[PDB]
Symmetry: D2
Subunit: 353 residues, 4 copies
C-alpha cells in the first residue's frame, strides 16, 4: 500500500516522449530484427547466400529508402548485428534511421523455451544481464526494445500457467527496460494457427491482455512509457467460417477497448501470416471502426513491409531501386492505413461482440 | 480458455443502453439511498423525527423537484423502503423518477463486515439470494444497482487480502446483476481518512482499480454494461500538504487512465466528505483536465446534492419550495461540472 | 507483511481441541444434515411422508442408537431444524449426541448458485449474516460446521474461475467460523461424474486442494482448527478402466500428501455415490497405504452410514431396532476402517 | 484442468531417489559453493591470497577429510569452478565427493537483481540457458542444484510483488531442473536482519512458504523430487526480546507444518548468521520438537561448518590436519543434531561460538 517510485519525473518524460514519437500520426514500425536463422529461409527463397554482407546490403536497402518513407516510419527494430553495422558511406545504421526521423529499436529476448507440464506451450527467456544490455544498447543508439511471447489457441491452451508466466516475464522485461530509458514494446502474440473462429480469438485475446496489464500493474510499469504489440483479432487459419475486414476490425477494437488502459501510448499490430495487402486493409479497417480508440492504432510489420521488396531484389544489386520501390509502396500504404485513410487506389453490429 | 457466453447480444444491448442513459452528457446520479440508520443523524440535525412518513416526504421533496433537474439527472439510487413508497398523488416513486427521464437504481449490498486478521479492514456482504432480489427489483422498476466496498489508507492498509477480497465480491455482485438485466455500479471506495498525501491516494487508487478490473475480467463481466463509482484522487482529509483543484484533477484522471478500460461506459464519482461546492469544483476540474478521457466523468452524489436542501427544509412542509430550490441549484451546478462548464463566479509528475 | 492476530491463544486452543476430538482414533462423522428437500427422494424410496415428525423420528432413530456407536462417532452434522428438535424423552438432540461422546456440527451454507459465463459450474452462498448465525449455533450446542462447494470434471471444467471462487468462499466461511469458536470443515467436493480416469481425478484434486490452502493462507485461517472433507481420488462413474482399492488409496493419499499441510488436524472423506461397503473398503485401504500420513484419515458419511438403516426402517416404528442395527454395523465397520483394521470377512506411477 | 505429465515414472523415481539420498538419516549438506568474491573475504581474514590454487586447496581440504564425515554428509554443493577442479591425486572433485558417499550439487543462479518500484527488494536471475547448463552439469557429475532468492523483513517488506516474483522464479528454476534429472533445492531465504521478534518472523515465513508452494503447484513441480532450504524461524538479529532454543524450534516447526506439504522429501536449513554451535543446537532442538514432522529436518551449512576449520588452517599447508579435524567435529555435531541426539557439553572452540552474521550490504 506504499509507493517507492520506480521512475523520476524526468525518466517518465523521457520514456513518454520516446513512445509518442514512435507512434506519431501516420507513423508505424518496420520490424527488420530477423536473426540469421530467420532471414536464412527468406534469402534462400530468392537463392541468396546468407552472409553478413548480404544481410547488411538487404538491411541497408530498407533503411536507406528515399525520404518518402520518413513520415511513414516512426521506428525501426534491429537485430543485434544490424545495430552495429554501417551503410556504404560509413554511417552507423542507427544514425541513418535517426536522420530520417525514426527511432531505433532493438530485439532483446533470447527466444522461447518449453514450459514443462503443458501441451507444447512456451515462455520466453532473456532476463539475465538484461539491465546491462539495455544500458549498452541505449548508449549505442536504441530507445525502445522488442520482446516476443507466444501463446497458442488449442483444446487446452492457452493454459492458466502459460498466460500467467508469459504475462509475468513481460512485466519483468518492461521493468528492466524502463530503468534504463528504453521503451518496452509488450508483445503477447496469440498465434492464428487452428480452426477456431473469430469470437474464440477475441475471447482469448481479451483474457490474455487482462492478465498482461494486471502483471504490468503488479510490477509498477509506467504505461505511458510503453507500447503494445498484439495480434489482430482474426479467425484461425483453418477456420471454415469467413469474415469481413469490418468484422475483424470490430472484434479487434472491442477486445482492446475492454482491456488496454487509455494510458498506453500506442498499439503496434503484428501482421502474423497476413499478406501485405491484407495487413494494410485490416489496419485501415481497424482505424475506421466506429468505436472510440484512446490509443494510436498502427503497425509493426516485418514481412508485411518486406515481402515484395525481398522478391524484387532477388539478391541482385541491379534490382536495388526496384526493391526499394516495393518497400516504399507498402510503407506509404500502411502510413495511410494507420490513419484510416487507406484506399486500394493509393492516396486518392457491436453487441454481437 | 474457452468461452461460455454469460450474456446474449440482446442482454448486452439492454445493459449497455441502460448504462449509457444514466451517464448521458450533462447527466449524473442522485444517491438518495440512505437507510433509516444512515439518515437518522441527518434528520436529528434538523430536529425532525425519523419516521417513515418524514422519510417519504423528504424523498418526495427531492424526487418531485421541477423539470429543471431533468437534464441533470440520469439516475436516482433508492433504498429498498423508498422503492416501494408513493408520492402524495399515489404515484410510485420509481414512476416519478422515470417520468422525469431518470433511470431507477437500488442499493443491494447488506453492509460491511470485518475481515479477521486485518487491522480493522472490511469486505461487503449481500450476495445471498441476490439473484432473486435483482429479478424482483427489475420487475419493480429498477434498472441498475449499488454495492459499496470500503478500503482505508493506513500504515498497513489496504492489505493484499482486503484488495483481493473486495475486488472479488464486487465481481460476484456485478455478475449476478447482469444476469438479471441490472446494470451494476462497481463501487470500490477508498476513504479519504488520514494524513496521507495526494501521491499516496493516487498510488493506492491505481492498485485498487487494477485489482478490480482483473477481477471483473476473471468473472466475465461485460464492462460496457457497468459503471464505476470511485473516490476522486485527493490528499488525506488530515494531510498537512495542500493542493489545487487542478492537481486533484490531474491525479484523478491519470489514475483512471492507467486502470479503467475504455469499454467502461462511465465513471460516477462519490464526493466523500467534500462540501457541495468543493464536489462541484473538483468534478469540473476533472472534466477540464487536458488528458484524453474515454469515459463519461460525472457524479453520483448524496450529501453533495442534498446538504442545503435538507437544511432549507428543516422538517417543515412550508419550506418545500425553498428546499427543492437548493437541490435544483446543486443539480444544475453538477450538470455543468460534468461537462467542464461550471464557474462558481507537467503530468509526468504524477 | 504485518500480523494482526485473528485469534488469541485461548481461541486457538478451543478450536484445535474441538477438531482433535472429532477425529480422535477410531472416530468419524455421521453426516445427518439433509434438508427437507434433499431427504425427500430417500423418504420417497421407502414410501414415507416427508413430514417434520417422520424426519424427527428418523434422526432420533440414528442419534439414539445403542452405545456401541459411541467410540465410532466423534461428530454428528445436523441440519438447522434438527438442532432444535428433541427426543421423545424431552432431551434436546444436541444433548443426546454429547451424552454419547459426540461433538455437534451444523450445516451453514445456503446451497450452490450458478457461475455466469461457465459451463454449468457453481459456487456456494451463505456468507450473509453468517457470523451471527455461528454465534447463535455455538450458544445452542454446535462446535463445528459444514459448508459444501461443488466442482465438476469435464472438457473445460473445473475452470480457473470456479477453482478460484470456490476456494475463496471456503476461506471466508472458514474465517467467520473461527471468529465464533466454530471449527470449519472445508469441503471442496469434486464430483465423480464423467468418464475420466483415476489419474485425471488425482490431477484435478491436487490443483483444487493447492488452491484451497493458498486461499486459507491468504485469509489467515488457523489450520490446526480446521478439518478437510475432500472426495477420495477415484475414476469417474462412467470410466471403463478398472482399478483396485489399493490404487484408489495410493492416488488419494498421494494427492493429499502433495497439497495438505501437516497442520491440518484431520481429513474426513465424503463418500459421494459409493455404497456403504465400498466406502468402508476404500477408507480402510487409504489407512493401510504405505506412505506417511500426518493427519487422521477418517469418515464424514451420510448415505454410506444410513443406506441400510433407512431401508430397514421403511417408516415403520416397529422396525426401530432393525434399522438402528444396520446403522450400528456401518458405524463399527468405518471405525475399524479409519484405523486400517476393517475386513468384510510403485508410487512413482502417481 | 488437463494433465500433460511433465515427468515420466522413471524420471520421478530418479529425482525422488536422489532427494532421499541427500537427506538420508543423519545426513546433511556441505555448502561449499561460495564464489570468488565471497571466498576472497574469507581468505583475506587469514592473510591468504585469493588465487585459484588457494581456493582449490581449501576446497580439497574440506572434501578430503577422513571417512568419519561420510555418514554425516549426504550432499556437497559446489561452485562452477570447483566442479571442474581436481584434488592433488588427479581425481575430479565430483569423484572425490561421490567416493565418500555424497551427492554432488551445483549452484546455478546468477545472483540477485533489484526489483524496480520496491524498497530495496530483489529477485534472482539465472534462467537463461538453464536447461542446457543443467544437462551439461548432470553429465559432469551433478545431481542437484542450488538457487538462492532473498527476502527481507522490514516496515514494508517483503512486499506482495517480491513474494510473488521470487516464488515464481523459484518455480521456473525447479521446473527446468527436473526436466534434466537434477533435484532442485528451493531456497526462499528470509534474512534475519532487523529488530523484529520471533512471531513476526514466523508470520512472514508462513506467508512466504505458502506462496512458494502455490507457485510450485502452478508450475507442475514434483515435490517428492525437491528439497526446501529455508531460514529457521528466529527473532531479528537486532531484536531485544530473548528466546530459548525450544521456542525457536517450536516456531520453526510450526511454520513448516502449516505450509510444507508432506510430499516434500526434506528440509535443509540455512544457518543465516548463527554461530557453528548455535546452528547445531537449534537444529537439534528442531528435531526434538514434540510436533509431528513428515520430512527430514537437516542442515545445508556453509560457514556454520567451516568457521573453525578456516581459522585452524590459517592458509598454512602445515595445519591441514588440524583444519580438517575442526570440520569433521562440526559435521559430526550436525549429524547428531539432525537426529535430535546432539549434546555439546565439552570442547567447542571459541570460534564455534562466534556470531557469523553479516549485515546485508
Amino acid at each position: 500500500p506504499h509507493s517507492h517510485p520506480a521512475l523520476t519525473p524526468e525518466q517518465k518524460k523521457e520514456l513518454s516522449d520516446i513512445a509518442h514519437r514512435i507512434v506519431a500520426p501516420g507513423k508505424g514500425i518496420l520490424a527488420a530484427n530477423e536473426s540469421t536463422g530467420s532471414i536464412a529461409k527468406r534469402l534462400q527463397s530468392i537463392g541468396t547466400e546468407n552472409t553478413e554482407e548480404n544481410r547488411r546490403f538487404y538491411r541497408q536497402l530498407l533503411l536507406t529508402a528515399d525520404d518518402r518513407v520518413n513520415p511513414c516510419i516512426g521506428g525501426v527494430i534491429l537485430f543485434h548485428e544490424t545495430l552495429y553495422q554501417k551503410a556504404d558511406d560509413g554511417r552507423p545504421f542507427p544514425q541513418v534511421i535517426k536522420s530520417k526521423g525514426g527511432v531505433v529499436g532493438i530485439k532483446v529476448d533470447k527466444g522461447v523455451v518449453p514450459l514443462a507440464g503443458t501441451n507444447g506451450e512456451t515462455t520466453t527467456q532473456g532476463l539475465d544481464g538484461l539491465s546491462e544490455r539495455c544500458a549498452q544498447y541505449k548508449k549505442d543508439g536504441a530507445d525502445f526494445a522488442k520482446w516476443r511471447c507466444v501463446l497458442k489457441i488449442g483444446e487446452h491452451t492457452p493454459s492458466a500457467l502459460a498466460i500467467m508466466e508469459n504475462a509475468n516475464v513481460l512485466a519483468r522485461y518492461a521493468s528492466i527496460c524502463q530503468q534504463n530509458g528504453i521503451v518496452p514494446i509488450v508483445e503477447p502474440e496469440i498465434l492464428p494457427d487452428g480452426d477456431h473462429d473469430l469470437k474464440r480469438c477475441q475471447y482469448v485475446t481479451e483474457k490474455v491482455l487482462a492478465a498482461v496489464y494486471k502483471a504490468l500493474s503488479d510490477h509498477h510499469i509506467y504505461l505511458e512509457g510503453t507500447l503494445l504489440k498484439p495480434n489482430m483479432v482474426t479467425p484461425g487459419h483453418a477456420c471454415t467460417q469467413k469474415y469481413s475486414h469490418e468484422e475483424i476490425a470490430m472484434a479487434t477494437v472491442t477486445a482492446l477497448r475492454r482491456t488496454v488502459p487509455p494510458a498506453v501510448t500506442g498499439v503496434t499490430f503484428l501482421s502474423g501470416g497476413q499478406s501485405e495487402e491484407e495487413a494494410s486493409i485490416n489496419l485501415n479497417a481497424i482505424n475506421k471502426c466506429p468505436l472510440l480508440k484512446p490509443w494510436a492504432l498502427t503497425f509493426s510489420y516485418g514481412r508485411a513491409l518486406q515481402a515484395s521488396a525481398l522478391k524484387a531484389w532477388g539478391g541482385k544489386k541491379e534490382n536495388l531501386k526496384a526493391a526499394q520501390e516495393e518497400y516504399v509502396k507498402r510503407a506509404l500504404a500502411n502510413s495511410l492505413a494507420c490513419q484510416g485513410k487507406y484506399t486500394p487506389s493509393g492516396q486518392a453490429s457491436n453487441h454481437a461482440y
